[PDB]
Each structure stands twice: as structure tokens, then as C-alpha cells.
């Protein structure tokens with residue numbers, strides 16, 4: 001559960017937040033496979049509460065009603081078709097499993113669900129599963145409100161309701177079995193792993209009991225004995241009694257300190273600078289690389305709903321975002337997840353975005369299809385960061401240098417740094433307020449390389465900047481602080 005059952009040579013996954021099943025299946029064939037992406041994290045595929053006030057917010061998908069594969073992304077048949085086609089092209093599917101809870105305790109009873117299933121929060125009745133009052137922690141939680149009130153108390157964080165969400169009694173074999181039933185149905189369909197949502201709100205031992213009931217991946221696509229890849233969402237920035245290390249026995253963990261610190265460093269907040277990235281990784285107090293799932297931003301903190309503060313970089317800050325993603329994809333620490341989102345009307349009032357609830361692009365509630373423009377960009381308000389030349393080429397960069405050591409590091413004591421990955425790739429950054437022009441040792445073999453950030457290598461030629469590596473591995477780099485993309489990356493496959 002620590003290894004990504006991704007195809008050999010593919011090292012990243014992309015989060016196609018709120019994408020429809022039919023759009024993902026197409027993207028797997030027309031883009032993801034050809035460009036070397038290893039997998040796709042999809043939004044919760046199980047039935048959720050249909051919320052009309054606000055109008056269909058993104059977060060309604062984190063309020064389960066049943067485990068029926070029927071949501072705004074599609075039905076069960078469309079979901080299976082997606083997993084099959086993607087798997088047939090070497091692109092894995094990872095499911096966002098919401099298993100810590102059901103929907104809000106205050107939600108009105110009725111059939112306001114994505115598939116018409118009836119449910120009654122007030123009476124803890126979820127017949128479509130089925131679940132009853134006996135399957136929740138109402139009698140176990142010790143707070144006066146019944147909800148989590150203080151994160152300094154490890155017990156209520158697990159036994160009480162996260163912002164009102166009915167908390168499942170995961171200690172009960174019956175509940176563990178209904179969740180396993182749901183997860184095993186997905187595994188048998190072809191899913192390669194799961195993102196365990198709100199893992200901090202579940203005891204490590206309860207998670208383990210559930211994982212012990214899981215099947216091995218589908219033998220039609222994976223080798224015998226393959227275990228599903230598991231990465232648990234645990235926000236641990238320190239200061240709390242719960243540590244992400246407490247979950248190492250179950251699988252990988254999300255390292256939120258990663259995007260938070262990269263954000264402050266690149267923004268140059270409070271005296272930080274890129275030169276300090278020399279010992280990036282465990283040196284910064286992060287969890288072991290082999291237990292880490294890293295990313296710059298996620299669906300939560302890109303809209304200020306998670307943890308990380310205002311330092312988090314997102315597509316809104318394009319120039320710096322591409323640099324942050326590039327550094328991440330070039331550095332060997334952890335398993336990388338690329339974000340892919342949609343645009344919403346950000347409206348800041350007194351320091352906060354009042355429209356942080358806006359759901360995916362839609363027409364009367366029906367999610368809009370992802371349209372592709374002649375320049376490979378997306379329309380219908382889908383950002384498609386994974387399609388940006390700079391990000392896509394760095395995804396390939398990571399594949400090419402997979403396994404190579406971190407070497408030939410250089411820094412000017414400020415914000416101009418560079419490092420290589422064995423003899424397969426080199427990358428340089430200029431985040432200072434002045435130009436960079438120096439000859440550095442790359443460790444690469446002599447030849448002419450195409451800069452994969454400012455261009456591509458097409459039919460024997462580079463469309464952008466060209467780098468010349470001498471016999472001794474030295475190469476000259478010139479990066480103006482006025483350049484669109486203040487960084488250059490070259491690797492074994494961009495050589496003429």
C-alpha cells in the first residue's frame with residue numbers, strides 16, 4: 001500500500017477535480033497516456049447530498065448518502081467504462097474514499113440526493129446502505145456540541161463530528177464491512193488505490209481493520225499480490241497531539257508542510273529564499289520520502305479551505321505556480337500529485353473569498369464537458385494545469401530522471417539555484433530581482449538540448465531556448481528576471 005501500481009516509467013498522478021467520468025476516459029486516451037501520466041485521482045464516486053443553497057457547491061460531494069456509483073460525474077456504467085479504458089492505456093484510477101462520515105446532521109431528510117436515494121440525518125437513517133443510529137458515534141463523542149471543538153484532544157477529533165458530519169462508528173465490524181464492501185467493489189472494477197479522506201478523524205487501528213478486508217488488485221490488469229495504493233489525508237503542520245507518523249502502518253500520508261513551505265519560500269515571505277532548499281525534504285522535518293504524497297496545492301487549500309494559509313500557490317498565481325510545480329517535479333522527494341482545476345469567480349472581502357463554495361462549470365447544475373482548444377488548452381472554464389506546456393513537460397522530466405540522484409547543486413546565497421538529477425537532467429531557477437548568467441556544471445553529456453519550459457523538441461529542432469553542453473558537462477545559462485518563465489530545464493530526451 002506504499003507503492004503506486006503505476007506503469008513503469010510513469011511517476012505522477014493528476015487530480016481531475018470534479019471531472020465527468022466520460023471526460024476522464026477520453027483524457028486518458030488522448031492525452032494522459034501519450035504524455036506519460038501515471039494516474040488520476042477522481043472525485044468521490046458515491047452518491048452524495050444534492051445541496052441547492054448554496055447552489056451545488058463542490059463540497060456537497062463530501063457528504064455521502066449511500067455507496068451507489070451515481071453522482072454528477074456519472075453513473076456506474078460510465079464509471080466502469082472510464083476505469084477500463086484508462087487501465088487499457090496504462091493510466092491508473094485512484095478513488096477519493098469518504099469513509100469517516102455520512103452527510104451533515106442538520107441536512108433535511110428526503111430524496112435530495114444525486115441518485116434519489118432516501119435518507120434521514122435526524123434519525124440516523126440511511127436505508128440505501130443501510131446504516132442506522134447504531135452505526136454512529138453519537139453516544140461515543142464526549143463534547144457538549146457533539147462536534148469537534150478542540151484539536152488538542154485526540155479523542156474527540158476521532159469520535160466526534162467534523163463540522164456536523166455524522167461520524168461512523170468505525171470500530172464496529174458491521175460498519176467496517178459495508179465500507180470494505182464498497183471499496184472492494186471499486187477494486188474489482190479496476191481501481192488501483194484510494195485517497196483516504198479525513199484520515200486524521202479515524203483511529204489508525206480502525207483504518208487498518210478495514211484495509212485488512214480489501215482484495216488484491218484486479219488480476220486482469222495487475223500482477224498477482226498487488227495491493228491497492230493508499231494515501232491518507234492527514235493535515236499535520238505540527239502543534240497537535242496527532243502525528244502523521246501514527247498512520248505509517250496503513251500507507252502513505254499527504255505532506256501538507258510541503259506546499260505550505262514551498263509557498264513561503266517562493267513568495268520570499270519573512271526572509272526565506274530558494275537557497276535554503278538545498279536540504280529540502282526530510283531536512284525540513286517532513287515525513288520519510290517513501291511515505292509521502294506531495295503537491296503544491298489541493299482542492300481544499302487552493303480556495304483557502306484547507307491548511308497552509310495565504311502562502312499556498314495556485315493557478316491564479318501562474319508565474320510562481322509553474323516554478324513551484326517545476327521544482328517539485330524535479331526534486332526526488334515523495335510521490336507527486338499535479339493539480340487540475342476549474343475557474344470560479346473569486347470575490348475577496350475583508351481578506352476572504354466569498355465564493356469559495358462555487359462548484360464546477362455547469363448548466364443548470366449539469367457539469368459542463370471539458371472542451372479542448374486547437375492549442376491543447378481547455379475551454380468551458382476548466383483550467384487544465386496538467387496541459388500547460390511548462391507543467392506537462394516537467395511531468396515527463398520526472399519520468400526521464402526517475403531513479404537518478406540529487407547532485408550538482410548551486411545557489412548564489414539568494415534566489416538563484418540549480419541542481420541536476422544524475423546525468424539525465426538539469427534545472428535552473430532565477431527568483432531574484434536581477435538577471436542570472438553563469439556557466440554551471442550539469443553532469444549531462446555533450447550536445448545541444450531543448451529547454452522544455454520555453455518550448456519543445458519537435459522534429460529535430462527546439463521551438464524555444466537551446467542549451468549547449470560542453471565535453472566537461474558545463475553549459476551557459478541566461479535567465480532574465482523579466483522572462484515569462486524564470487526557469488530552464490533540460491533532460492536526456494530533449495537533446496538533439
Ligand SMILES: C[C@H]1O[C@H](O[C@H]2[C@H](O)[C@@H](O)[C@@H](O)O[C@@H]2CO)[C@H](O)[C@@H](O)[C@@H]1N[C@H]1C=C(CO)[C@@H](O)[C@H](O)[C@H]1O
Nearest residue numbers: 059062063098151197198199200233235300305306307
Ligand atoms: C476541510 C478539512 O478540515 C479539517 O482540516 C483541519 C485540520 O485538520 C486542522 O489541523 C486545521 O489545520 O484546520 C483544518 C480546517 O481548516 C479536516 O481534518 C480535513 O480532513 C478536511 N479536509 C477533507 C475532509 C472533508 C470532509 O469530508 C472535505 O470537506 C475536504 O474536501 C477534504 O479535503
Ligand SMILES: *[C@@H]1O[C@H](CO)[C@@H](O)[C@H](O)[C@H]1NC(C)=O
Nearest residue numbers: 457458459460461462463496
Ligand atoms: C531543424 O530546423 C531548421 C530550421 O530552423 C532546419 O534547417 C532543419 O532541417 C531542421 N532539422 C530537421 C531534422 O528537420
Ligand SMILES: [Ca+2]
Nearest residue numbers: 158159167201
Ligand atoms: Ca471519526
Ligand SMILES: [Cl-]
Nearest residue numbers: 195233254298
Ligand atoms: Cl489531499
